[PDB]
Amino acid sequence: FQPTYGVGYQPYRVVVLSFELLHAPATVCGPKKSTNLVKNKCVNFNFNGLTGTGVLTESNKKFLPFQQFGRDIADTTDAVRDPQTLEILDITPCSFGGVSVITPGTNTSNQVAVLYQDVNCTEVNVFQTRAGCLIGAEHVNNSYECDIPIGAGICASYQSIIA
Amino acid sequence: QCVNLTTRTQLPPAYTNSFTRGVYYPDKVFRSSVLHSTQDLFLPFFSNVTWFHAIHKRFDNPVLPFNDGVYFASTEKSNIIRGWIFGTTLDSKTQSLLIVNNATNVVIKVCEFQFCNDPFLGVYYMESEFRVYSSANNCTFEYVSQPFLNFKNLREFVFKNIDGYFKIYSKHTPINLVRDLPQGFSALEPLVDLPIGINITRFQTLLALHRSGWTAGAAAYYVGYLQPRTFLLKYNENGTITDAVDCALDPLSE
Amino acid sequence: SALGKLQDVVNQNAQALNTLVKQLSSNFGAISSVLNDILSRLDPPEAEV
Amino acid sequence: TKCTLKSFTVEKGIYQTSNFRVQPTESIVRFPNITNLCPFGEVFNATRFASVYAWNRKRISNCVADYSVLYNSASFSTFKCYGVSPTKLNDLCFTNVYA
Numbered sequence A: 001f002q003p004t005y006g007v008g009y010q011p012y013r014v015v016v017l018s019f020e021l022l023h024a025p026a027t028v029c030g031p032k033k034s035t036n037l038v039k040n041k042c043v044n045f046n047f048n049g050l051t052g053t054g055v056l057t058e059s060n061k062k063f064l065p066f067q068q069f070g071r072d073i074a075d076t077t078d079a080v081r082d083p084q085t086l087e088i089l090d091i092t093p094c095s096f097g098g099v100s101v102i103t104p105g106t107n108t109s110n111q112v113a114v115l116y117q118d119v120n121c122t123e124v125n126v127f128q129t130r131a132g133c134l135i136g137a138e139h140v141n142n143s144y145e146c147d148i149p150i151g152a153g154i155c156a157s158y159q160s161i162i163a
Numbered sequence B: 001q002c003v004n005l006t007t008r009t010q011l012p013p014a015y016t017n018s019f020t021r022g023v024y025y026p027d028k029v030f031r032s033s034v035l036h037s038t039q040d041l042f043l044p045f046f047s048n049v050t051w052f053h054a055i056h057k058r059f060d061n062p063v064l065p066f067n068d069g070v071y072f073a074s075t076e077k078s079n080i081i082r083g084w085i086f087g088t089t090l091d092s093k094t095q096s097l098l099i100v101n102n103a104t105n106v107v108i109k110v111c112e113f114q115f116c117n118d119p120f121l122g123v124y125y126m127e128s129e130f131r132v133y134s135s136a137n138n139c140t141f142e143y144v145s146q147p148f149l150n151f152k153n154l155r156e157f158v159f160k161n162i163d164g165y166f167k168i169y170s171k172h173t174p175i176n177l178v179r180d181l182p183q184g185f186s187a188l189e190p191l192v193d194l195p196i197g198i199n200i201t202r203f204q205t206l207l208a209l210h211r212s213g214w215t216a217g218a219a220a221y222y223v224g225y226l227q228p229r230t231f232l233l234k235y236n237e238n239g240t241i242t243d244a245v246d247c248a249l250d251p252l253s254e
Numbered sequence C: 001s002a003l004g005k006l007q008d009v010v011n012q013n014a015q016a017l018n019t020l021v022k023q024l025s026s027n028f029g030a031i032s033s034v035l036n037d038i039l040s041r042l043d044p045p046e047a048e049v
Numbered sequence D: 001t002k003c004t005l006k007s008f009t010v011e012k013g014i015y016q017t018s019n020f021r022v023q024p025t026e027s028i029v030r031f032p033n034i035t036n037l038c039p040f041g042e043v044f045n046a047t048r049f050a051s052v053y054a055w056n057r058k059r060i061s062n063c064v065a066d067y068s069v070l071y072n073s074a075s076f077s078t079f080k081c082y083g084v085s086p087t088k089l090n091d092l093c094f095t096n097v098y099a
């Protein structure tokens, strides 16, 4: 080898990578990509192969250091540990609920109110009940007889629609 | 280098009661204030656990089966028990697993060791004697890690081999009981998972001699065998398994 | 055990809900009980089955 | 409500007509810190290489390999992957690599 050589006589360093896969457990993988953690939003989470959809909030459950996920009685993942920063996150399910329409007769009026059951009013004449969020009904401080039952002691009537 | 130990005293190995020992965490999932029924390879309650001694002249390094899994208990003072050997034929024909804890570090190697008939470490009164294997030709897995370790210390280990995965569970307990296994409950936390992917049917305990012939330091260990069964585990408010029920022991626990 | 009649109804309803939730963990002869695993592992002709 | 009740006239009352489910917005795929990278620097940037009759073999195992620091390196004159696509190396997991 001289440095004055032409191409094809110059030295070439060659590395041959042979990826072989025997049925022993595989231990050579690529970089597992990670993205910034977003909390308090209904996101699709994928934590160490455990996937799902939920709202990831801060948790007061103190895990033991070998434990990663958390399950309730009904075997649903409600707590998890972030692998980047060892912190515990609660996985609340994303809000779902029945949509009910409260109306008088169409012979009387076409005005309606909408009840989103078990849904907070910030996640949808807006009133928060224990039955859910009621939109389109004016809440009054007076007490009358029950005309249209809403639930949890709340009733609706037509006089506009009041609750 | 291999050395036959020819000054042993003939004595049958002993047997004793497992009580409620050998329970390990079956998975990596946090559970709190719950009663969870799980079916896994567990050590049965109040079972016949085999007892081996090291006392002076007893030096118990026999050939034991591995079967589906091994519970290894150690009533230890002054650090005689140092590691384990796993394999099928324990020679260069098959591939064998070495776990050692010498005076510096913990070494795990998967090689085809030509093992001695009596593998051992030694302490001179300093460690200057190591006779475990005579050769090591084809090595696939190496892993150097942290040190895992009247009888003062209790060491519980659970060794399992499922789907090419070697699960080692460990628990360290301060005790002050003289001779036998203390009666109580302690759930074994997972120590390490090794992707060794080898067939294991036989295993060896590695001990250490004391030289000043040879003298065996006072130590005792216990070997039990795991069986597939159901336990009802109780998880407290802190996520720690505090009590267990063997589902097939007696009709009350059933 | 004075109030056992109400507690029996509460326990039966809670046990029925727990059994109905637990039945989602069963695959019923399929390869998995998780729908996302089937939809990410298989083509739609066999994932339909 | 008229669609649900199959009628053009609706009697006074409350009628459960539909459902509202919050729908996801982002995907968060959090993984452990990328640690114990494979020692490709001791293979490619080695001071002394071997001859071809006595070629060196390094058993790359028990580590994670960033293959796209090689495929995006300007230095290599030849980069020919035969059994595998080049960009798919960061996703496929192999039992071990021989260099």
Ligand SMILES: *[C@@H]1O[C@H](CO)[C@@H](O[C@@H]2O[C@H](CO)[C@@H](O)[C@H](O)[C@H]2NC(C)=O)[C@H](O)[C@H]1NC(C)=O
Binding pocket: B002, B003, B004, B117, B118
């Ligand atoms: C320690 O004792 C064992 C058991 O006797 C020895 O193993 C035998 O060694 C002889 C040597 O020729 C072989 O022919 C036998 O086949 C061996 N038996 C087994 C079961 O392997 C061992 O060699 C002794 N150690 C030393 C250093 O001599």
Ligand SMILES: *[C@@H]1O[C@H](CO)[C@@H](O)[C@H](O)[C@H]1NC(C)=O
Binding pocket: A083, A084, A085, A086, D033
């Ligand atoms: C990952 O890195 C962060 C900071 O870079 C550190 O705080 C965290 O402990 C690391 N994760 C582990 C498991 O060590």
Ligand SMILES: *[C@@H]1O[C@H](CO)[C@@H](O)[C@H](O)[C@H]1NC(C)=O
Binding pocket: B015, B048
């Ligand atoms: C344990 O086994 C030995 C022999 O295998 C037997 O003599 C002994 O009685 C057994 N112990 C119990 C508690 O059954």
Ligand SMILES: *[C@@H]1O[C@H](CO)[C@@H](O)[C@H](O)[C@H]1NC(C)=O
Binding pocket: B102, B103, B104, B105, B107, B127
């Ligand atoms: C312990 O074993 C390792 C691996 O063989 C070795 O490098 C080290 O020197 C040993 N230490 C002692 C004190 O023997």
Ligand SMILES: *[C@@H]1O[C@H](CO)[C@@H](O)[C@H](O)[C@H]1NC(C)=O
Binding pocket: B137, B138
């Ligand atoms: C195992 O080692 C022997 C002797 O060193 C050698 O002849 C054989 O090819 C090796 N086998 C493998 C699979 O490495």
Ligand SMILES: *[C@@H]1O[C@H](CO)[C@@H](O)[C@H](O)[C@H]1NC(C)=O
Binding pocket: B088, B199, B200, B201
């Ligand atoms: C593992 O070893 C045992 C005992 O040597 C043998 O019976 C069994 O067939 C082996 N397993 C396989 C898959 O060869």
Ligand SMILES: *[C@@H]1O[C@H](CO)[C@@H](O)[C@H](O)[C@H]1NC(C)=O
Binding pocket: B236, B237, B238
């Ligand atoms: C749980 O932990 C708290 C402190 O974090 C402690 O006060 C309490 O005694 C523990 N409970 C049990 C059953 O150990």
Ligand SMILES: *[C@@H]1O[C@H](CO)[C@@H](O)[C@H](O)[C@H]1NC(C)=O
Binding pocket: D040, D041, D044, D045, D069, D073
């Ligand atoms: C060799 O070193 C150079 C400069 O430090 C770097 O760009 C290159 O990636 C290295 N090669 C490897 C790590 O294979």
